[PDB]
Amino acid sequence: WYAQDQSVALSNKCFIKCADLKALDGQYIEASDIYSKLIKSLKDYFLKKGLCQLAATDAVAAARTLQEGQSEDPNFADSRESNFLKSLIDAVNEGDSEQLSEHCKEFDNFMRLDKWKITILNKIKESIQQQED
Amino acid sequence: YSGKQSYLGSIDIDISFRARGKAVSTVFDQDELAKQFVRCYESQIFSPTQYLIMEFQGHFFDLKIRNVQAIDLGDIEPTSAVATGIETKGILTKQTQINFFKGRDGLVN
Amino acid sequence: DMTNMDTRTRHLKVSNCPNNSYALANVAAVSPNDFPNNIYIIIDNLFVFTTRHSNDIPPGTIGFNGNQRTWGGWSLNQDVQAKAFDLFK
């Protein structure tokens, strides 16, 4: 309804709430799509998109989201968030859950992970450990 | 597509532990892996640089075709060079000269 | 009771354990039509296991956990020979 009213900022608040609740609810793909709409805070949107993709065992789409943000948005290219996302993708491709944990602790040390990121990161770790088992 | 070079004369596969924290240093026999690989993937078109997952001894391995040598059925002496490009293709057979090498992990011996 | 049993060899497939509780149970899960319940069976004349009736495994197949495959030098879907056992003799 806001998007019809051309209220971009409010509509963006709304789709942030929708995407966060969807991602917490296991609808990772749909949340990633809403994050694509929100992208089209930007650094944060890129991170979250990749994270949902990683919760959907979708490492390649996370890599593309990273590449998209790096090429299109210079502030995201050099950011800590892009570095965190590449490190997570590398861990996921490596099947290395402790490396994922280490990267999480580093990023927590420099940029506090809110409860949402912690939940999604735990889901990603669990998917790695399940593949290991 | 290939016309005559439709079989594999020699196929080299780099074998890695998918789970490298679980690694084992013992000497691996290429032939056992060859038997099970052919058993699992007989009569299939293969090209180099192909990522695959393969189970062996409860240890799962990523198998990456390094290079493919394509020969026709009838060459007593393999005259086709060991090619690395994706263009070369051949169907796996028991007589293929299978060579195995250090995986993406570099841990397998 | 192990006095009377069909000791005939069978060709059975290795498979993933049906679930973790079965792996903990350390009992070869077999269909009722395969062999009796609560009896010791040998495999390859070397690996001894305790049968237990299990409806999720069809006749002609045996379920194994990871440790047993590790011990036995086996991959999944590997065809093995299974026979009855009787340690006392």
Curated annotation (Swiss-Prot), chain A:
<comment type="function">
    <text>SNARE complex protein that binds to cis-SNARE complexes on membranes and is required for vesicular transport between the endoplasmic reticulum and the Golgi apparatus and for homotypic vacuole fusion. During the priming step of membrane fusion, is released from cis-SNARE complexes by SEC18 to establish a pool of unpaired SNAREs, which are required for interactions in trans during docking and fusion steps. Can displace HOPS from SNARE complexes, which may be a prerequisite for trans-SNARE complex disassembly and subsequent rounds of priming, docking and fusion.</text>
</comment>
<comment type="similarity">
    <text>Belongs to the SNAP family.</text>
</comment>
<comment type="subunit">
    <text>Binds to vacuolar cis-SNARE complexes composed of the v-SNAREs NYV1, VTI1 and YKT6, and the t-SNAREs VAM3 and VAM7. Interacts with SEC18.</text>
</comment>
<feature type="cross-link" description="Glycyl lysine isopeptide (Lys-Gly) (interchain with G-Cter in ubiquitin)">
    <location>
        <position position="105"/>
    </location>
</feature>
<protein>
    <recommendedName>
        <fullName>Alpha-soluble NSF attachment protein</fullName>
    </recommendedName>
</protein>
Curated annotation (Swiss-Prot), chain B:
<comment type="subunit">
    <text>Homohexamer. Binds to SEC17.</text>
</comment>
<comment type="function">
    <text>Required for vesicle-mediated transport. Catalyzes the fusion of transport vesicles within the Golgi cisternae. Is also required for transport from the endoplasmic reticulum to the Golgi stack. Seems to function as a fusion protein required for the delivery of cargo proteins to all compartments of the Golgi stack independent of vesicle origin.</text>
</comment>
<protein>
    <recommendedName>
        <fullName>Vesicular-fusion protein SEC18</fullName>
    </recommendedName>
</protein>
<comment type="similarity">
    <text>Belongs to the AAA ATPase family.</text>
</comment>
